């Protein structure tokens, strides 16, 4: 019958997802072992299901494992250490996280003849290179989910022609602004889109033609592998150990707490690292502009709009504005820029 549409993302930083109903979810890309949560059930009332995703996922052979995942995994000390998430696209780390949002974004009691289009993405250099790696993994995806503490299952199995493949940052401007920026696009310019990811920051440019339609440039656009917010967590982790002078290491949760604040609490004291947070944010923003103008000669003057996105783009927008003032603006949903771009351009099918 008619098939539903759910747009997800495989971001190493945090998983970003939305359905056809615009009901959207967001949670960090961290998994852990699952343990029986009934003692904490009586003390604090579990209201936020996204905060408390204890979950068990069957295979087709009745094998399933307990999992804490996300914020609940970030409270665990032995979770996925988040600096070492598996770069294999077919990892079980990928498997649980992929079924996680699909459990959360399928509403209750849809008809079984109504399937769901899933819309995903890859980093831009890694899209065609790893397309069939994901394509077989999407067809291999055949599970059944069970939520602990909320107790509603989903049957999850899809073949080819139920899936959708467009890169990270591609449909973010190829949809959702492409039918809206027509007042600004005139002829033979370039719109600028930079998705500031956690591991990898993506640089993507669209040339507009004579016919007021976007066309893609691949020599002026690239994936910055190893450039992203992961540099800041790695930098400030040295900054805490250099300021503590003891070898005291923050955990995984204090790491992500640090580069949102710059003021970690530590043993009756706030170890002040706000100055080093200023040091990282100006350094990374300078590094993005330099790699941008590596791809950009005098065609930077051929720009008319520069949009940025990502959670890093939410927190670097002032320093990343300095490519071009009055042209470096921010997109509406910096996290969900891929998500609705996957959604509306997934509505073509």
Ligand X SMILES: Nc1ncnc2c1ncn2[C@@H]1O[C@H](COP(=O)(O)OP(=O)(O)O)[C@@H](O)[C@H]1O
For residues 84 and 108, which CB has a smaller minimum distance to a second copy in the complex?
108
Q: Binders of Mg ion among 181-200, rule CB under 5 A?
A: 197
Q: Which stretch binds ligand X (CB under 6 A): 39-47, 112-120, 194-202, 207-215?
A: 194-202
Stated length of the chain = 349
Q: Which stretch binds Mg ion (CB under 5 A): 6-14, 31-39, 159-167, 249-257?
A: 6-14
Q: Which does 173 bind (CB under 5 to 8 A by kind): Mg ion, ligand X, a second copy, none?
A: none
User: According to the binding rule CB under 5 A, does residue 11 interact with Mg ion?
Assistant: yes
Q: Which of 17, 171, 197, 341 binds ligand X (CB under 6 A)?
A: 197
CA distances from 289 to 240, 259, 335 (A): 27, 21, 21
Q: Binders of ligand X among 211-270, rule CB under 6 A?
A: 229, 259-260
User: According to the binding rule CB under 6 A, does residue 166 interact with ligand X?
Assistant: no
Least Cβ distance, residue 215 to ligand X (angstroms): 20
Least Cβ distance, residue 311 to ligand X (angstroms): 2
- Residue whose pair of structure tokens reads 């992203």 in the numeric block: 228
For residues 98 and 340, which CB has a smaller minimum distance to a second copy in the complex?
340
- Cβ neighbours of residue 315 closer than 8 Å, sequence gap 6 or more: 281
Q: Which of 146, 314, 319, 321 binds ligand X (CB under 6 A)?
A: 314
For residues 94 and 338, which CB has a smaller minimum distance to Mg ion in the complex?
338
Q: Which stretch binds ligand X (CB under 6 A): 5-13, 53-61, 134-142, 211-219?
A: 5-13
Q: Is the dihedral of CA 141, 122, 340, 67 positive or negative?
A: positive
Q: Which of 169, 171, 311, 346 binds ligand X (CB under 6 A)?
A: 311
CA distances from 86 to 12, 58, 92, 251 (A): 9, 21, 9, 19
Q: Give 195-258 as a 3 state SS string.
A: ECCCCCEEEEEEEECCCCCEEEEEEEEEEECCCCCHHHHHHHHHHHHHHHCCCCCCCHHHHHHH
Q: For strand 303-309 and strand 328-330, is the pairing parallel, antiparallel, or unpaired?
A: parallel
193/36 Cα distance (integer angstroms): 45
Can you list the pairs that 321-325 forms with residues at least 24 positions away whose Cβ atoms lie under 8 Å? 322/285, 322/289, 323/192, 323/289, 323/292, 324/300
Q: How many CA atoms lie within 13 A of 288 on its CB side?
A: 32
Least Cβ distance, residue 258 to a second copy (angstroms): 11
Q: Which of 5, 7, 11, 126 binds ligand X (CB under 6 A)?
A: 11
Least Cβ distance, residue 195 to Mg ion (angstroms): 5
Least Cβ distance, residue 286 to a second copy (angstroms): 14
Q: Which of 7, 13, 34, 117 binds ligand X (CB under 6 A)?
A: 13
For residues 48 and 290, which CB has a smaller minimum distance to a second copy in the complex?
48
- Cβ neighbours of residue 203 closer than 8 Å, sequence gap 6 or more: 194, 221, 222, 223, 224, 291, 292, 295
Q: Which of 6, 16, 98, 193 binds ligand X (CB under 6 A)?
A: 16
139/160 Cα distance (integer angstroms): 6
Q: Binders of ligand X among 170-189, rule CB under 6 A?
A: none
Q: Which does 276 bind (CB under 5 to 8 A by kind): Mg ion, ligand X, a second copy, none?
A: none
Phi and psi (nearest 5°) for 24? -115, 150
Q: Which residues share a beta bridge with 38?
A: none
Residues in contact with Mg ion by the rule CB under 5 A: 11, 197, 338
**Which residues of this protein are in contact with ligand X, per CB under 6 A?**
9, 11-14, 16, 197-200, 229, 259-260, 310-312, 314-315, 335
């Amino acid at each position: 019958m008619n098939k539903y549409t759910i747009a997800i993302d495989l971001g190493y930083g945090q998983i970003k997802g939305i359905n056809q109903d615009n009901k959207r979810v967001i949670f960090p890309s961290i998994i852990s072992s699952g343990k029986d949560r009934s003692l904490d059930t009586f003390f604090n009332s579990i209201d936020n299901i996204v905060d408390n995703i204890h979950v068990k996922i069957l295979d087709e052979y009745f094998n399933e494992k307990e999992y804490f995942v996300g914020e609940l995994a970030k409270r665990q000390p032995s979770n996925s250490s988040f600096i070492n998430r598996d770069n294999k696209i077919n990892s079980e780390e990928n498997k649980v996280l992929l079924a996680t949002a699909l459990g959360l974004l399928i509403p209750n009691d849809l008809p079984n003849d109504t399937k769901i289009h899933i819309v995903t993405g890859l980093p831009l250099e890694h899209f065609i290179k790893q397309k069939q790696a994901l394509n077989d993994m999407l067809k291999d995806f055949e599970h059944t989910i069970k939520f602990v503490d909320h107790n509603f299952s989903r049957n999850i199995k899809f073949e080819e022609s139920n899936i959708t493949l467009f890169p990270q940052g591609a449909g973010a401007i190829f949809s959702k602004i492409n039918n809206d920026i027509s007042s600004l696009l005139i002829k033979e310019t370039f719109i600028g889109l930079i998705d500031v990811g956690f591991k990898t920051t993506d640089i993507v440019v669209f040339r507009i033609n004579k016919d007021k339609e976007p066309v893609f440039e691949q020599e002026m656009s690239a994936t910055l592998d190893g450039l992203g917010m992961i540099n800041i967590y790695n930098t400030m982790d040295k900054a805490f150990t250099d300021n503590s002078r003891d070898g005291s290491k923050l955990n995984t949760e204090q790491l992500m707490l640090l580069c949102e604040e710059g003021k970690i609490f530590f043993k009756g004291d706030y170890i002040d690292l706000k100055k080093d947070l200023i040091k990282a944010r100006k350094t990374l923003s300078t590094n993005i502009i330099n790699k941008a103008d590596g791809l950009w000669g005098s065609r930077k003057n051929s720009f008319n709009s520069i949009m940025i996105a990502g959670g890093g783009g939410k927190v670097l927008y002032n320093h990343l504005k300095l490519i071009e003032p009055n042209m470096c603006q921010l997109i509406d949903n910096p996290e969900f820029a891929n998500a609705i771009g996957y959604l509306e351009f997934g509505k073509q099918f």
